[PDB]
């Protein structure tokens, strides 16, 4: 989508594997604010907004 009409996908009731994203070589920026990438694969959240 365009940045004025940015797509929001609500992610619920599943298992989120964040190490697949973190260990990928295809991403240039993976800057996390408020949480560290190492404990993302452990913690649990109510909803994820993408």
């Amino acid at each position: 989508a365009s940045v004025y009409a940015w797509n929001r996908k609500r992610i619920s009731n599943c298992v989120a594997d964040y190490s697949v994203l973190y260990n990928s070589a295809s991403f240039s920026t993976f800057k996390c604010y408020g949480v560290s990438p190492t404990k993302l694969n452990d913690l649990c959240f109510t909803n994820v907004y993408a």
């Binding site: 609500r10 619920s12 009731n13 909803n47």
Partner: protein
Amino acid sequence: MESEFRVYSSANNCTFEYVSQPFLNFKNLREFVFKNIDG
């Protein structure tokens, strides 16, 4: 043939969706208990 659904008119902000396997002289007796404890 089931061809009439008139239960709602809108759906705006969804927080949770869950699709599952079907739960189901009078021949069947269905007992259900619904509880709301700590969310």
